[PDB]
Amino acid sequence: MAPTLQLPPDVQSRLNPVQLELLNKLHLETKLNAEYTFMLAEQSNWNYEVAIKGFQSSMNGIPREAFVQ
Numbered sequence: 001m002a003p004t005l006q007l008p009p010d011v012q013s014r015l016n017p018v019q020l021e022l023l024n025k026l027h028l029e030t031k032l033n034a035e036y037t038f039m040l041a042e043q044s045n046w047n048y049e050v051a052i053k054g055f056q057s058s059m060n061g062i063p064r065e066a067f068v069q
Contacts (some may be wrong), residue, residue: 001069003027006034019046030055033069036062 003023004012012020019041025048027037032055044051055062 001034003034003037007038022046022048022051026051032062032066036066 004020007023015023023034023037023041026032026041027034029052030037030040032040040051040055044054
């Protein structure tokens, strides 16, 4: 389920269109569920390269539940 379909509008309200695009792109690439994709994006301070590098270097910290959806 694509993040922009799963996140309620009132949560998406705090985000600009390129942040929403980043969420969708990160979801398509990492296969994290929408919740954890959102968290990674937040943790990365909404920076794609930082998010991917963070993901690639913290894989062993991510529970299996993060990929379920």
